[PDB]
């Protein structure tokens, strides 16, 4: 083809954590959108089997690291699902070294 790019997700993929989503959607209904932005490799909607049937959120994995960035800033505070007063939040499930607060002496 022209663009092609039919391969596999990068070795170190980024797990984008999406929040502010109602428990009335479906992976086949959410994957599409993102798919238009990036070649999603795997999608999973955090859904417990005890009480957290739906943690009003879902995990997304973009094949290309860069791509994710696009959809992130492209979607983040950009799209607002029906029923949610606030827009859709998009942030990577990364843990930045931190754990301290409490200045003094000015």
Curated annotation (Swiss-Prot):
Highest taxon above the source species: Eukaryota
Start and end residues of each RRM domain: 14-95
Subcellular location: Nucleus; Cytoplasm
Tissue and organ distribution: Ubiquitous. Strongly expressed in the cerebellum, hippocampus, amygdala, temporal and frontal cortex and frontal lobes.
The family this protein is said to belong to: Belongs to the CELF/BRUNOL family.
Role this protein plays: RNA-binding protein implicated in the regulation of pre-mRNA alternative splicing. Mediates exon inclusion and/or exclusion in pre-mRNA that are subject to tissue-specific and developmentally regulated alternative splicing. Specifically activates exon 5 inclusion of cardiac isoforms of TNNT2 during heart remodeling at the juvenile to adult transition. Promotes exclusion of both the smooth muscle (SM) and non-muscle (NM) exons in actinin pre-mRNAs. Activates the splicing of MAPT/Tau exon 10.
Protein name, entry field: CUGBP Elav-like family member 4
Organism in which the protein naturally occurs: Homo sapiens (Human)
First and last residues shown, out of full length: 48 to 141 of 486
């Amino acid at each position: 083809g022209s663009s092609g790019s039919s391969g596999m997700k990068d070795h170190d993929a980024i797990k984008l954590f999406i929040g502010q989503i109602p428990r009335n959607l479906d992976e086949k209904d959410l994957k599409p959108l993102f798919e238009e932005f990036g070649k999603i490799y795997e999608l999973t909607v955090l859904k417990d089997r005890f009480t957290g049937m739906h943690k009003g959120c879902a995990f997304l994995t973009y094949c290309e690291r860069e791509s994710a960035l696009k959809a992130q800033s492209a979607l983040h505070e950009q799209k607002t699902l029906p029923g949610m007063n606030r827009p859709i939040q998009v942030k990577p499930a990364d843990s930045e070294s931190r754990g301290g607060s409490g200045p003094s002496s000015g």
